């Protein structure tokens, strides 16, 4: 994946 999940993952490095 969702818009949040994708950004959250990006912010973490996943
Ligand atoms: C595509 C996806 C599915 C589940 C969880 C995540 C995710 C979200 C935040 C951080 C990380 C490392 C992974 C992504």
Q: Is the minimum distance from the CB of 8 to ligand 1 under 6 angstroms?
A: yes
Question: Which region holds residue 5: left if phi is over 0, alpha if psi is between -120 and 50, else beta?
Answer: alpha
Residue 1, CA distances (Å) to 12, 13 in order: 14, 14
Q: What is the largest CA-CA distance in the chain?
A: 16
Q: Is the minimum distance from the CB of 14 to ligand 1 under 6 angstroms?
A: yes
SS3 2: coil
Question: Which region holds residue 2: left if phi is over 0, alpha if psi is between -120 and 50, else beta?
Answer: beta
Experimental method: NMR
Q: How far is the CA of 10 from the centre of ligand 1 (A)?
A: 9
């Amino acid at each position: 994946x969702t818009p949040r999940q994708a950004r959250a993952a990006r912010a973490a490095x996943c």
